[PDB]
Amino acid sequence: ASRLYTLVLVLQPQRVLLGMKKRGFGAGRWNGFGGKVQEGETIEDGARRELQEESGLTVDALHKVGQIVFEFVGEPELMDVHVFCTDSIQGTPVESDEMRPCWFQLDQIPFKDMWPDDSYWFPLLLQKKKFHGYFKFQGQDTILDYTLREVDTV
Numbered sequence: 001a002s003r004l005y006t007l008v009l010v011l012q013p014q015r016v017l018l019g020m021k022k023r024g025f026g027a028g029r030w031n032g033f034g035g036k037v038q039e040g041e042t043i044e045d046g047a048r049r050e051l052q053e054e055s056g057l058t059v060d061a062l063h064k065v066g067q068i069v070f071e072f073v074g075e076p077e078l079m080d081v082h083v084f085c086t087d088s089i090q091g092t093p094v095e096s097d098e099m100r101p102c103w104f105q106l107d108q109i110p111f112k113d114m115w116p117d118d119s120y121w122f123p124l125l126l127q128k129k130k131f132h133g134y135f136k137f138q139g140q141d142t143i144l145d146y147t148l149r150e151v152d153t154v
């Protein structure tokens with residue numbers, strides 16, 4: 001009862017790229033770039049594809065940084081999200097009907113307009129730590145319970 005997703009963070013030494021989602025799941029928040037892994041597709045290939053579709057950027061090197069499972073009470077399917085980061089990209093970010101990308105200085109990450117769990121694991125991401133997390137949500141705004149631990153192997 002878990003569905004595979006990817007999430008990609010473009011993280012450079014002084015800034016991170018986030019995309020304001022205009023519609024659908026996560027609309028109105030600054031998100032990384034991700035989505036469902038397809039049939040016959042590797043998780044990493046899925047991550048590379050989502051980054052291109054949503055941001056217009058071509059990734060070169062992708063690095064595994066975490067796994068987060070999300071539970072929404074009242075929803076049977078868990079999201080099994082494989083989180084990646086990259087500092088090595090081609091292209092310039094593209095604004096589309098679906099997504100408005102913007103660069104943020106690392107001290108100006110807009111956590112109040114991001115998914116609430118980001119506040120918990122972004123600090124780890126920023127310091128190049130790897131992690132496993134689980135967040136139980138009620139609706140899209142309330143974290144009921146969570147676990148988060150650093151790991152050596154994602």
Ligand SMILES: CC(=O)Nc1cc2ncccc2c(-c2cccc(C)c2C)n1
Nearest residue numbers: 005006007025026031032034035070115
């Ligand atoms: C920084 C960031 O994006 N954080 C972030 C936080 C999330 N929190 C809860 C559920 C999903 C989240 C997602 C997410 C992950 C993969 C696919 C999709 C559609 C979404 C909404 N991303």
